Amino acid sequence: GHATHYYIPASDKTVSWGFFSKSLKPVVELESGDFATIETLTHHSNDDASLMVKGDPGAESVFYWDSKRKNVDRRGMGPMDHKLGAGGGMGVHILTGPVAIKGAEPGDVLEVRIVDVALRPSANPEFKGKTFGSNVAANWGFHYNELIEEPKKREVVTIYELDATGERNWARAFYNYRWTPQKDPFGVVHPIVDYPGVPVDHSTISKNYNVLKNIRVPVRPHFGTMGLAPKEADLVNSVPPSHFGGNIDNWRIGKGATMYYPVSVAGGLFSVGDPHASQGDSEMCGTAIECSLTGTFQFILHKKADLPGTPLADLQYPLLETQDEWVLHGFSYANYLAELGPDAQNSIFSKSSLDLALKDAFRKMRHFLMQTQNLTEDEAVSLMSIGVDFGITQVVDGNWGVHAVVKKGIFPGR
Amino acid sequence: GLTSGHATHYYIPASDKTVSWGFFSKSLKPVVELESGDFATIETLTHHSNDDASLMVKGDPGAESVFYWDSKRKNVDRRGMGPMDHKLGAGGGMGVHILTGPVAIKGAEPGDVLEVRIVDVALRPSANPEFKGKTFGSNVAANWGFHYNELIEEPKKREVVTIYELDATGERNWARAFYNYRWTPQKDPFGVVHPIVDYPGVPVDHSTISKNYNVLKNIRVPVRPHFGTMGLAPKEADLVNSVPPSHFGGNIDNWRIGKGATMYYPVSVAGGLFSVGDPHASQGDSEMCGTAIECSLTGTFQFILHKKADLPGTPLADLQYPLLETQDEWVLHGFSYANYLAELGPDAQNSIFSKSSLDLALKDAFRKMRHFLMQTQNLTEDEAVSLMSIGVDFGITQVVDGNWGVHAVVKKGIFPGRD
Ligand SMILES: [Cl-]
Ligand SMILES: [Mg+2]
Ligand SMILES: [Mg+2]
Ligand SMILES: [Mg+2]
Ligand SMILES: [Mg+2]
Numbered sequence: 001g002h003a004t005h006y007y008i009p010a011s012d013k014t015v016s017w018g019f020f021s022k023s024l025k026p027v028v029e030l031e032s033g034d035f036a037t038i039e040t041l042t043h044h045s046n047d048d049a050s051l052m053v054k055g056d057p058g059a060e061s062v063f064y065w066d067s068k069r070k071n072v073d074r075r076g077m078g079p080m081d082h083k084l085g086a087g088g089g090m091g092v093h094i095l096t097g098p099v100a101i102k103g104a105e106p107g108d109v110l111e112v113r114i115v116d117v118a119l120r121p122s123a124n125p126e127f128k129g130k131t132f133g134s135n136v137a138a139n140w141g142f143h144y145n146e147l148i149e150e151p152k153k154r155e156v157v158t159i160y161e162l163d164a165t166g167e168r169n170w171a172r173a174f175y176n177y178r179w180t181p182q183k184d185p186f187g188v189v190h191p192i193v194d195y196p197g198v199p200v201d202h203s204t205i206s207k208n209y210n211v212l213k214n215i216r217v218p219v220r221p222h223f224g225t226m227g228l229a230p231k232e233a234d235l236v237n238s239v240p241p242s243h244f245g246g247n248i249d250n251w252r253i254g255k256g257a258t259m260y261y262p263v264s265v266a267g268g269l270f271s272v273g274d275p276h277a278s279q280g281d282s283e284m285c286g287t288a289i290e291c292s293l294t295g296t297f298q299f300i301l302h303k304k305a306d307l308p309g310t311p312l313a314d315l316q317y318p319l320l321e322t323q324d325e326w327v328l329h330g331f332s333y334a335n336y337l338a339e340l341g342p343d344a345q346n347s348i349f350s351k352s353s354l355d356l357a358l359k360d361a362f363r364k365m366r367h368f369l370m371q372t373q374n375l376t377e378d379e380a381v382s383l384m385s386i387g388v389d390f391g392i393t394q395v396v397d398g399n400w401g402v403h404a405v406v407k408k409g410i411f412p413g414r
Numbered sequence: 415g416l417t418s419g420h421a422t423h424y425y426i427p428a429s430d431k432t433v434s435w436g437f438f439s440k441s442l443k444p445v446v447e448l449e450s451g452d453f454a455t456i457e458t459l460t461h462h463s464n465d466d467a468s469l470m471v472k473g474d475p476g477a478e479s480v481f482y483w484d485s486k487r488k489n490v491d492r493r494g495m496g497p498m499d500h501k502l503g504a505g506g507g508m509g510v511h512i513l514t515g516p517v518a519i520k521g522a523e524p525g526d527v528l529e530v531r532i533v534d535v536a537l538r539p540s541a542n543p544e545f546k547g548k549t550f551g552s553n554v555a556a557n558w559g560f561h562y563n564e565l566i567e568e569p570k571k572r573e574v575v576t577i578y579e580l581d582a583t584g585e586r587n588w589a590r591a592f593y594n595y596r597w598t599p600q601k602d603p604f605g606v607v608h609p610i611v612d613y614p615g616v617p618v619d620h621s622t623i624s625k626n627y628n629v630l631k632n633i634r635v636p637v638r639p640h641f642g643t644m645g646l647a648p649k650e651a652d653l654v655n656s657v658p659p660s661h662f663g664g665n666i667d668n669w670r671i672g673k674g675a676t677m678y679y680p681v682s683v684a685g686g687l688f689s690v691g692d693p694h695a696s697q698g699d700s701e702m703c704g705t706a707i708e709c710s711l712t713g714t715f716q717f718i719l720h721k722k723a724d725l726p727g728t729p730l731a732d733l734q735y736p737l738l739e740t741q742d743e744w745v746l747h748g749f750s751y752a753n754y755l756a757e758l759g760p761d762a763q764n765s766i767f768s769k770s771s772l773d774l775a776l777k778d779a780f781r782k783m784r785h786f787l788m789q790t791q792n793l794t795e796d797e798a799v800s801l802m803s804i805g806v807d808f809g810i811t812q813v814v815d816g817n818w819g820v821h822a823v824v825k826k827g828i829f830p831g832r833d
Contacts, residue, residue, distance in 0.1 A: 377567040
C-alpha cells in the first residue's frame with residue numbers, strides 16, 4: 001500500500017536558527033521505518049539575496065527582515081536582548097526540525113539513512129538551472145590570525161555557482177568581496193560577520209568577478225549539522241558538534257551515507273541544516289560552500305536492548321556507514337556539554353584541540369574494534385596504526401574534529 | 415647524442431659499510447656520488463628485524479652484517495645522535511632508523527631542490543628456507559606511541575610486538591598477522607637491560623617472551639609499501655636525530671611515499687647527501703601506536719637536480735619543505751615546526767619531543783599550502799584561503815616522531831595550469 005513519508009519544507013514555521021533544544025515542539029512525529037524529505041537552507045543566503053533568497057518563498061519566509069519585522073528573530077542560544085540581535089549569533093545554523101521518533105528513549109540509537117540529496121535551485125530567472133552558495137573566510141576561521149596580505153584583519157565572501165541539475169559535477173567561483181560594515185534593518189552595525197543572516201547592501205561592497213579562474217572544485221554535497229537534541233541544556237549552541245551529532249562538518253555525510261546517533265532525550269528530536277555543496281577536510285577558513293539542499297531520509301530506531309552484538313553496541317557518538325567504510329567522529333571533548341561542566345558553551349571555544357580530538361578518535365576506534373569486531377586491545381592498537389586513516393574534520397566549530405576511516409572489506413565479519 | 419650506451423645506475427646493498435643508524439649528518443662521507451638523471455637501486459633494512467631474527471635476520475648476509483652484536487663488539491655501534499658512552503648504548507637510541515647512504519649529487523648547492531623519483535619497490539625476501547616467497551615485518555605498540563598512556567586492559571603499561579607475514583612476490587596484496595607478544599625486559603649482549611624498547615636493534619630472546627598466534631584472525635591488511643625516512647642531511651647541525659622530520663625530509667611516515675611517488679627536498683648542504691631507510695610494508699595515517707609494519711624493502715630511484723635559478727614559475731618555486739607528487743595529486747607536509755632545528759634553537763633535538771602539536775602542524779600545513787597556491791598556482795591569498803577550505807583535504811601523517819605531521823592533499827586535475 002503506502003509507506004509513511006513526510007515532506008518538511010523550509011520556512012519560518014519549520015526551522016530553528018542557531019540552537020538545538022530538547023523542549024522545542026516537533027514539526028512532525030514519525031515511526032521507525034518512515035521517510036521524510038526535508039528541505040534545508042543555508043544561513044549564508046543573504047550574502048547574495050538576489051541569487052539565494054529573492055523569488056524563493058521558503059527562503060523569503062526565513063530571511064525576512066525589515067525595520068518593521070523579522071520573521072525569525074532568535075538566531076543562536078543567547079539572550080533575546082543580546083546587543084548583536086536576539087540569540088546573539090551564539091549558533092548560526094538554520095535547523096529544520098525537530099523530528100520526533102515514536103518510542104525513542106534515552107539509550108536508544110537512531111539510524112538516519114541519507115538516500116538522496118538535491119541542490120535547491122535558485123529562483124532567479126536569469127539563472128535557471130543553477131544554485132548558488134557562499135564560502136566565507138571568517139573571523140572564527142583557523143586562517144584568520146595568519147593572514148599576510150594587508151589588511152590582515154579581513155573577512156572575504158566568495159560566491160560559487162553550482163549546476164542544480166547535477167549534470168556538471170564541479171563548482172565555479174562567481175565573484176568575491178571583502179566584508180564591509182553592514183547595518184542591519186534594526187540599525188545594528190556589523191563590521192565583522194558576528195550575527196547570521198544580515199542582508200548585505202550590494203552598493204557597499206566591491207565585487208571581484210575573476211576569481212579562482214578555471215578551477216573546477218569537486219562537488220561533495222552534505223549536511224554540515226545533523227543530530228539529536230542533547231539533555232544537558234535547554235538551549236544549545238548549534239556550532240559545536242558533540243556526542244549527539246550536530247555540526248560535525250564531515251563532507252562525507254551526504255547521499256549514500258547512513259548516520260547513527262545516540263538518543264539522549266525521549267522522542268530523539270532530530271534536526272538537520274547547515275547544508276554544504278562541498279568542503280575540504282579541515283574547513284580551514286571557517287565555512288564550506290554554504291549552499292541550500294533538500295534531502296530524503298529514512299529513520300530507523302534501534303532499541304538499547306538490541307544493540308549488543310552489532311556495530312551499534314554501546315554506541316555513544318556519531319557513527320557514519322557507507323557501503324564500503326565505517327567513519328567514526330572524534331572531538332576535542334566527546335561530550336563537551338558534560339565534560340566542560342556548566343560553562344561548557346562558553347569555555348569550549350577556549351579549549352579547542354586537535355590533539356585531544358585524536359585522543360578521542362583513538363578511544364572510539366578502539367571501542368568500535370573491541371566491542372563490534374571481536375578484537376583485543378592489542379589487536380585493535382596494531383590494526384589502527386596500519387589500517388585505519390585518521391583525518392582532520394574541522395578546526396572551526398569550537399569542539400574540533402578528527403575522523404577515523406576503516407574499510408569494511410578487510411574484516412571477516414561476525 | 416643518438417648513440418646507444420650505458421646509463422649510470424648504482425646498486426647499494428644494505429650492510430655495515432653502507433648504513434648509518436639513527437642519524438643524519440652532513441659530515442658523513444657519501445657511499446656514492448652520482449649525477450643528475452642517474453639511478454640507484456638501494457636496499458633498506460628495518461631496524462625491527464631483531465624482533466624475530468629467525469624471520470628477518472638469520473641467513474640474510476646484509477641483515478646479519480648490520481645486526482651483529484656479541485659480548486665483545488657490534489658491527490654498527492652508534493645508534494642515534496647521542497653520546498658514544500650513553501648508558502643505553504652508543505648513540506643513546508636518540509634516533510632509531512637504519513639509513514642507507516649518503517648519496518651525493520654532483521653540483522647540488524644549498525638553495526637547489528632535489529627530485530627523487532621512486533620508480534620501483536620490492537619486499538626484501540626472508541632468507542628463512544621454511545618461508546620461501548615470504549617477507550616478515552614487525553609492528554610495535556611502543557612507549558612513544560600516542561596510545562601508550564591510554565591503555566585500558568591490564569597490564570596498562572606494556573609494549574606489544576606484532577609480527578606480520580607478507581607475500582614477497584606481491585601476488586597477494588595484503589598482510590596477515592602471524593603472532594604477537596608483550597615486550598619483557600631484554601638484556602643485550604653488553605649486559606644492559608632494556609625494560610622498554612629504549613634502544614634499537616636489541617636481539618629479543620624468545621625464551622623470555624610468550625607468543626600468541628593467529629591474532630587479527632582473517633583480517634586482510636592492505637599493503638602500502640613506503641619509505642618512512644628519506645631526505646637530505648641538513649646544514650643546521652652535525653649529528654641529527656633521525657626520528658623527527660623537518661624541512662630536509664627525514665622520518666615523514668607518510669604511507670604515500672612509495673612506488674610511483676616523486677619527492678622533492680630543499681638542498682641545504684653541498685652534495686645534497688640523500689639517505690633512505692625505515693622501510694614500511696603498510697601504515698595508516700597517524701601511525702598511532704608508534705610504528706608501522708616495519709619491514710625491509712629495496713627501492714629503485716632516479717635523482718634529478720633542480721638549480722635554484724630554475725625554480726621560479728614551477729611547482730618548486732621557493733620550495734622549503736618536502737613536497738610529494740603522484741600522477742594525480744600534490745601532497746604537502748606540515749610539521750609542528752617547519753624547521754625545528756632553526757626554530758627551537760640549540761636544545762631543539764630535545765625540546766621537539768615536548769613541543770609536539772597537531773594544532774601547530776596544521777598551522778604549518780596552512781602556510782605551506784597557501785605558499786604553494788600563491789607562488790605556483792597564481793592565486794591571491796583570498797583565493798587560496800577559499801580553495802583550501804573547499805578543495806584541499808588535510809590529514810594526520812603521524813603523531814609519534816616528536817615533530818608531528820599533517821599533510822595537505824590537492825588534486826592536479828582541478829587546475830587550469832600555467833598559461
Ligand atoms: Cl646506436
Ligand atoms: Mg557546519
Ligand atoms: Mg556550514
Ligand atoms: Mg618512521
Ligand atoms: Mg618505521
